[PDB]
Design an enzyme around this catalytic site. Structure first.
Site, mmCIF file in Angstrom:
data_model
loop_
_atom_site.group_PDB
_atom_site.id
_atom_site.type_symbol
_atom_site.label_atom_id
_atom_site.label_comp_id
_atom_site.label_asym_id
_atom_site.label_seq_id
_atom_site.Cartn_x
_atom_site.Cartn_y
_atom_site.Cartn_z
ATOM 1 N N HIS A 151 0.848 -1.217 0.000
ATOM 2 C CA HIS A 151 0.000 0.000 0.000
ATOM 3 C C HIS A 151 0.882 1.265 0.000
ATOM 4 O O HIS A 151 0.348 2.374 -0.217
ATOM 5 C CB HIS A 151 -0.948 -0.032 1.194
ATOM 6 C CG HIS A 151 -2.340 0.416 0.943
ATOM 7 N ND1 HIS A 151 -2.956 0.414 -0.291
ATOM 8 C CD2 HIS A 151 -3.262 0.857 1.829
ATOM 9 C CE1 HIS A 151 -4.192 0.856 -0.144
ATOM 10 N NE2 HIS A 151 -4.405 1.095 1.136
ATOM 11 N N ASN A 165 -6.644 6.276 4.005
ATOM 12 C CA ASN A 165 -8.070 6.548 3.715
ATOM 13 C C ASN A 165 -8.404 8.003 4.033
ATOM 14 O O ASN A 165 -9.547 8.422 3.748
ATOM 15 C CB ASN A 165 -8.961 5.542 4.430
ATOM 16 C CG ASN A 165 -8.756 4.141 3.877
ATOM 17 O OD1 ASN A 165 -7.882 3.900 3.046
ATOM 18 N ND2 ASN A 165 -9.597 3.205 4.263
ATOM 19 N N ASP A 200 -0.360 2.562 -5.268
ATOM 20 C CA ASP A 200 -0.448 1.105 -5.508
ATOM 21 C C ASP A 200 -1.703 0.778 -6.326
ATOM 22 O O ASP A 200 -2.805 1.345 -6.049
ATOM 23 C CB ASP A 200 -0.461 0.330 -4.200
ATOM 24 C CG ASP A 200 -1.570 0.705 -3.236
ATOM 25 O OD1 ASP A 200 -1.720 1.905 -2.946
ATOM 26 O OD2 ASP A 200 -2.231 -0.227 -2.740
ATOM 27 N N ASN A 238 -8.914 3.313 -1.708
ATOM 28 C CA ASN A 238 -9.507 4.164 -0.643
ATOM 29 C C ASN A 238 -8.662 5.425 -0.377
ATOM 30 O O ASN A 238 -9.194 6.379 0.218
ATOM 31 C CB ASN A 238 -9.810 3.342 0.610
ATOM 32 C CG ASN A 238 -10.851 2.267 0.354
ATOM 33 O OD1 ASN A 238 -11.789 2.468 -0.409
ATOM 34 N ND2 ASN A 238 -10.615 1.077 0.863
#
Lengths: 193, 193
Positions: free
Chosen positions: B22, B70, B95, B116
């Site tokens: 991520h 997020n 990513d 997100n």
């Protein structure tokens, strides 16, 4: 007072973290809230989700920080100060690397033990709050810890943790009534059936 | 107007997330910053780490949100507003589950595709920014996604991703010099095999 008036669950926000071992505290407090029909509501002033209601004849506040784990003090500290709750009346439920799945213990005082959620709380309110240490096992090296805490346990380990949490939920009556040494004896004695 | 003046890398703060998939966007911007001798400094005003310097004769700003993935908009939005940088001048590195390790593409516009981090940005600045989509592979089911993105890639996958990032880095001159179509051609032609 001696009575536990504030029960905090540590963890990370969002469905992607909900089943990870680092959310053991969330599991305990979410289950405790529904057991007593206490509604957890968005509490953006204190960067958390929070509720209040009767648990076993006592008015108890429930808090889930929504700060992410390593910033939990940004919720717990102003929340506990606004409501003038002393550390001695706080119980913080958290995942414990140093205990196995199906081991669960109540501790009073001491340090963070490398727990980055407790690390963000102890500096501000001091160490004299109670902890519900929910065993999640240690993967056997520092390097493996992140993948472990940010991982979902396999079902045999999850059932062990779920049993220990169920046991602890059944002892919250002693904690909110201020019978902390009896709660400690009775929680700590737990072994999987 | 066509010149990229702000390059954002998406990711999570802290050493426990630094090597996770991520954080692909952080890898790209960290490597870009040191390639050009641009210091990334704490920037608490914009809830991030930021730098500024000369890339190939252009004044470019670099931003790593420290919000957690997020909540990346909490950094990108106020930062872009304060320096009055329009979306068309923004490149966001992230990513990409829907591309294999070693695949890398420059995309202009469109949606978040269930990412997100992009989900927290598109609603505020709109979709018309550029994206560096760093393939990380898809674990093959929605339930496996969180463990994949919060996981460290094996060495073979990490080599593929690193080679793709290296190639993208070689093309940043074209991006900052307002040659986006040329940069898109030359980036998206990268073959990891």
């Amino acid at each position: 007072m001696s009575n536990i008036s504030l029960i905090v669950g540590l963890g990370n926000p969002g469905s992607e973290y909900a089943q990870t071992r680092h959310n053991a505290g969330f599991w305990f407090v979410e289950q405790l809230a529904d057991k007593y029909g206490i509604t957890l509501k968005n509490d953006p002033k204190f960067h958390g989700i929070s509720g209040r209601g009767n648990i076993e004849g006592h008015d108890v506040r429930l808090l889930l920080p929504m700060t992410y784990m390593n910033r939990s003090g940004q919720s717990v500290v102003p929340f506990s100060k606004f409501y003038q709750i002393a550390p001695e009346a706080i119980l913080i439920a958290h995942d414990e690397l140093d205990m196995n799945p199906g081991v669960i213990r109540l501790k009073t005082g001491g340090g963070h033990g490398g727990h980055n959620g407790l690390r963000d709380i102890v500096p501000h309110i001091g160490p004299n709050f109670h902890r519900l240490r929910i065993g999640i096992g240690h993967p056997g090296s520092k390097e493996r810890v992140s993948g472990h805490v940010l991982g979902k346990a396999p079902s045999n380990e999850q059932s062990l943790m779920d049993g220990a949490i169920d046991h602890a939920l059944s002892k919250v009556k002693l904690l909110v009534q201020g019978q902390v040494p009896q709660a400690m004896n009775q929680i700590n004695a737990y072994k999987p059936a």
